[PDB]
Design a protein around this ligand. Sequence first.
Ligand SMILES: Cc1cc(C(N)=O)c(C(F)(F)F)o1
Length: 209
Amino acid sequence: EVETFAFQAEIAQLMSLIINTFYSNKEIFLRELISNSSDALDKIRYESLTDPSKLDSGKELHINLIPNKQDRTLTIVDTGIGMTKADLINNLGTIAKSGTKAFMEALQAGADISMIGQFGVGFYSAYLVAEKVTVITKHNDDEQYAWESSAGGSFTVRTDTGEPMGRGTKVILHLKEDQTEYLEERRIKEIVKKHSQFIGYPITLFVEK
Ligand SMILES: Cc1cc(C(N)=O)c(C(F)(F)F)o1
């Protein structure tokens, strides 16, 4: 059972701007997703400070980067707080409508796409490099769900029958044909060192056979 939803008009317009604007500095997508993972890990850590059972779904707080050249996917896994079904539908837990408004005033005033994370909609920078994004997520208070969108104005949500996750979020980037540099070990290492040196969780770059 798959539910199909329309993006709010303002979010559809943000996505088309990210997809259509000429902008060479695409590597910031990884910084933005790692920062989102760090924020989610901070949230479950804070909740666990007064309720240790919040970590019964997994004590380890980490971020994994998993490239797969055969599937042409880059997967970013964290064991943060995750999102409920309602969170997924409501723009993956963001205030994306007001964030898009502020972001787009900034660009018309001199900002560039790399400051997208200052407006709370950094997730959508994934479409700088991905033709399709799948988000698998599990929050302590809900079941495991899969969100998916190839932009074009709609997203789907379904119960996930795949490998159970325990708790956290997995962002699967189905990369564009000309963006496969983000599957190469040395390129990912360079980006992580450049933009994510002060993330307070272990970031593990998986290698391939
Ligand atoms: C906005 C937001 C939060 C998270 C998360 N829970 O880690 C994500 C992700 F994963 F889709 F990129 O986006």
